[PDB]
Amino acid sequence: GSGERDSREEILKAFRLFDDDNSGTITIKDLRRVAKELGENLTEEELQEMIAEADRNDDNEIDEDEFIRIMKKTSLF
Amino acid sequence: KKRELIESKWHRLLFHDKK
C-alpha cells in the first residue's frame, strides 16, 4: 500500500531534475544538459535514440506519462 | 541489442553512482 508514498514521487523528482528548461517535458536539450553535467558528452544521435525509445507523442519531448512508462520499463523506478 | 544499449543510457543518467 504505497499509494501516496510510491515510486511515482521519485519518478517525478527525476522528471523535474531532468526538465532543467522547465518545459513540463524532458527535451533533447534537457537530456544533453543532464548528460553534460554528469560528464556524459552524448551525441545528437544517442540522445535521439533515448528520446525515440520513450517518445510516443511525436513532439520530441518526454512527457510525464512517457517518462513514468520508461522508468517502469527499465526498472529505474 | 540497441533497445538494451539505449535503456542503459536512461539507467546510467540516474544510476550515475559517482562513476
Please answer whether residues A34 and A20 qualify as being in contact, where contact means their C-beta atoms are separated by less than 8 angstroms: yes
Under the phi-then-psi rule, with left for phi > 0, alpha for psi from -120 to 50, and beta for the rest, what region is A31?
alpha
Neighbours of B10 (CB within 10 A): 22
Grid cell in block for residue B6: 539505449
Sorted by sequence, the CB contacts under 8 Å of residue A37 that are 6+ apart come out as none
B16 and chain A: CB distance < 8 Å anywhere?
yes
Q: Do A49 and B9 count as a contact with CB atoms less than 8 A apart?
A: yes
Which of B10, B14, B16 is opposite residue A50, by nearest beta carbon?
Answer: B10
Enumerate the β-bridge partners of residue A26.
A62
Neighbours of A7 (CB within 10 A): 13
Task: Report all structural domains of chain A as residue ranges with CATH numbers, in order of start.
Answer: 1-77 (1.10.238.10)
Distance from CA of A18 to the nearest CA of B (A): 9
Sorted by sequence, the CB contacts under 8 Å of residue A25 that are 6+ apart come out as A19, A59, A61, A62, A63, A64
Q: Do A74 and B7 count as a contact with CB atoms less than 8 A apart?
A: yes
